[PDB]
Design an enzyme around this catalytic site. Structure first.
Site, PDB file in Angstrom:
ATOM      1  N   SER A 214      -2.699   5.625  -6.776  1.00 19.30           N
ATOM      2  CA  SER A 214      -2.491   4.214  -6.341  1.00 19.30           C
ATOM      3  C   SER A 214      -1.343   3.430  -6.674  1.00 19.30           C
ATOM      4  CB  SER A 214      -3.728   3.455  -7.089  1.00 19.30           C
ATOM      5  OG  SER A 214      -3.986   2.093  -6.436  1.00 19.30           O
ATOM      6  N   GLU A 347     -10.966   6.904   1.625  1.00 20.77           N
ATOM      7  CA  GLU A 347     -10.319   6.182   0.602  1.00 20.77           C
ATOM      8  C   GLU A 347     -10.972   4.733   0.644  1.00 20.77           C
ATOM      9  OE1 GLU A 347      -7.714   6.353  -1.266  1.00 20.77           O
ATOM     10  OE2 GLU A 347      -6.603   8.163  -0.840  1.00 20.77           O
ATOM     11  N   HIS A 467     -11.354   6.520  -2.923  1.00 19.35           N
ATOM     12  CA  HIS A 467     -10.076   6.280  -3.754  1.00 19.35           C
ATOM     13  C   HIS A 467     -10.417   6.345  -5.332  1.00 19.35           C
ATOM     14  CE1 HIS A 467      -6.084   4.572  -4.476  1.00 19.35           C
ATOM     15  NE2 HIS A 467      -6.650   3.766  -5.099  1.00 19.35           N
TER      16      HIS A 467
END
Length: 566
Positions: A214, A347, A467
């Site tokens: 990230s 995601e 994610h």
């Protein structure tokens, strides 16, 4: 976050303390550093392995008082033994479970782990930079435990760096010396310490891999772009992000004033007076109020965080980002080291929590103008050109008459992650020696083993691979448990840590000593490739064409009449 998850967390926090004590040993050890001697301790893991642990190693001066908002300074040396058997505090930040501010301005530390302090050959050095939007996160082992990695013969290092406005305030006035990106400059000095000291821990300084997820992926990319770190490390892994993601930088020079005003500042908008107020303010007050800084216009245009990586307005000795990230790629030393990049298979499934509090956001897909890249869209998002680009997005993700929440989370996959990856690959191809880049797609779904981000995204009993779901197979966390060696979860821990360490060692992520990679032919991407190929990591390891490709190209078509902006 709900009262039930609060108490559930409280109890696991209590469990983690007692587990951490039980897993400690009396075997303390002393290592040399260029700043003086450090005392570490051997610890156990729930898989009955063990590792040497050095925590709270300072790589910079505590950035307090007059050092606040400023570039980091090299720490003071000591002659004696520094106690590194315990962890230091995290950067000042809002706790996502409790909602209360926690942490300390004295947060510039790194941790060093390895199963063997005295290896017979110098080992690959892995450096993890945590994500958290540049506003949360830590190198504490209750979130990033080295327990899986230390099964392999590597040296693993987890750093901290300043978050939020304390990390990323930025002022135009050149006299004040707050150009921005202090938190990235923290990352730089930690790299330099790692270069110059990893040999004392068995680490090979000529084989260093930096990787992050990230905001940690964006950070890793920044560390590959800046001239500040040239030649410092040798491999990079970008996990679910990079520096040209739209959340990964922002021009925040005006927002210092807003934060001051929120915090009680009385006076005018000039940088000097604003800074003096912010310098004396309590750090928790500043961090608590960061949520409120962004205007409704900014949130509408998908500005995600008030303070972050920025183009510094004047150049200084320690300057990290002197131009926009897209411009820096064109001259990046990092373009010429072995790179691995990848994303999860869903995601955007992360955004479910936010969708539940804001159902109205799904109506945004009716024209999709808010998701047109800022640099292409007009102010009000009302220009006919903007509606036209918005339509190309809508055709790509809206499946029926009326847009759905799944349509939205699918769009976000591309807005936030796949499209920036596509732009970076193509841009990079135009300015590189020809070092390989490999692509992976993490597609392994399990609810038997999880990590704390599932609490945040309200991901309880939700199928699909969001994610941050992959972190569970890289690091121990206080929600983890011992998994049977035959379980699909344990196997994936082996595969993930295996590939990562394989890539760190050779710059090539393939090995037939990894279970399931027998028929894998993992090729790097070539500039001639119309279609990206990736290793798709599920229960089986399968090389496939990137499934998101068609939508990826639809997004590119928005730049048809603006190819120079691509």
């Amino acid at each position: 976050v709900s009262l039930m998850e609060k108490l559930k967390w409280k109890i696991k926090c209590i469990e983690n303390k007692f587990l951490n004590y039980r897993l400690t040993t009396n075997e303390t050890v002393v290592a040399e550093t260029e700043y003086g001697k450090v005392k570490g301790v051997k610890r156990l893991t729930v898989y009955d392995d063990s590792y040497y642990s050095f925590e709270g190693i300072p790589y910079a001066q505590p950035p307090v008082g007059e050092l606040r908002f400023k570039a980091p300074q090299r720490p003071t040396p000591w002659d004696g033994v520094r106690d590194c058997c315990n962890h230091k505090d995290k950067s000042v930040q809002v706790d996502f479970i409790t909602g209360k501010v926690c942490g300390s301005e004295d947060c510039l530390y790194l941790s060093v782990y390895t199963n063997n302090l005295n290896p017979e050959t110098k080992r690959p050095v892995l450096v993890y930079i945590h994500g958290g939007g540049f506003i949360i996160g830590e190198n504490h082992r209750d979130m990033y435990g080295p327990d899986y990695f230390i099964k392999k013969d590597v040296v693993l290092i987890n750093i901290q760096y300043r978050l939020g406005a304390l990390g990323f305030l930025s002022l135009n006035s050149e006299d004040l010396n707050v150009p921005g990106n202090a938190g990235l400059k923290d990352q730089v000095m930690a790299l330099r310490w790692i270069k110059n000291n990893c040999a004392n821990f068995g680490g090979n300084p000529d084989n260093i891999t930096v990787f992050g997820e990230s905001a940690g992926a964006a950070s890793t990319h920044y560390m590959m772009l800046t001239e500040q770190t040239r030649g410092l490390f040798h491999r990079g892994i970008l996990m679910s992000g990079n520096a040209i993601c739209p959340w990964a930088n922002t021009q925040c020079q005006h927002r210092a004033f807003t934060l001051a005003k929120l915090a009680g500042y009385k006076g005018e908008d000039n940088d000097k007076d604003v800074l003096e107020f912010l310098m004396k303010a309590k750090p928790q007050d500043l961090i608590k109020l960061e949520e409120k800084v962004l205007t409704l216009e900014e949130r509408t245009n998908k500005v995600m965080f008030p303070f972050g990586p920025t183009v510094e307005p004047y150049q200084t000795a320690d300057c990290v980002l002197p131009k926009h990230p897209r411009e820096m790629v064109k001259t990046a030393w990092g373009n010429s080291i072995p790179t691995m990049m990848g994303n999860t298979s869903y995601e955007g499934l992360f955004f479910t929590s936010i969708l539940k509090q804001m159902p109205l956001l799904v109506k945004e897909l009716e024209t999709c103008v808010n998701f047109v890249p800022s640099e292409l869209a007009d102010a009000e998002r009302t220009a006919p050109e903007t509606l036209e680009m918005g339509a190309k997005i809508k055709k790509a993700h809206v499946t029926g008459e009326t847009p759905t929440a799944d349509n939205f989370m699918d769009l976000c996959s591309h807005f936030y992650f796949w499209f920036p990856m596509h732009r970076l690959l193509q841009l990079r191809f135009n300015h590189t020696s020809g070092t390989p880049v490999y692509l992976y797609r993490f597609d392994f779904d399990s609810e038997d083993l999880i990590n704390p981000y599932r609490i945040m995204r309200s991901g309880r009993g939700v199928k699909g691979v969001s994610h941050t779901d992959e972190l569970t197979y890289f690091f121990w966390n206080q929600l983890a448990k011992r998994m049977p060696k035959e379980s699909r979860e344990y196997k994936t821990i082996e595969r993930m840590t295996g590939i990562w360490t394989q890539f760190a060692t050779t710059g090539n992520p393939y090995s037939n000593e990894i279970e399931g990679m027998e028929n894998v032919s993992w090729d790097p991407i070539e500039k001639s490739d119309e279609v990206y190929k990736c290793l798709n990591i599920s229960d089986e390891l399968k090389m496939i064409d990137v499934p998101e490709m068609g939508k990826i190209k639809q997004w590119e078509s928005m730049f048809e009449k603006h190819r120079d902006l691509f």
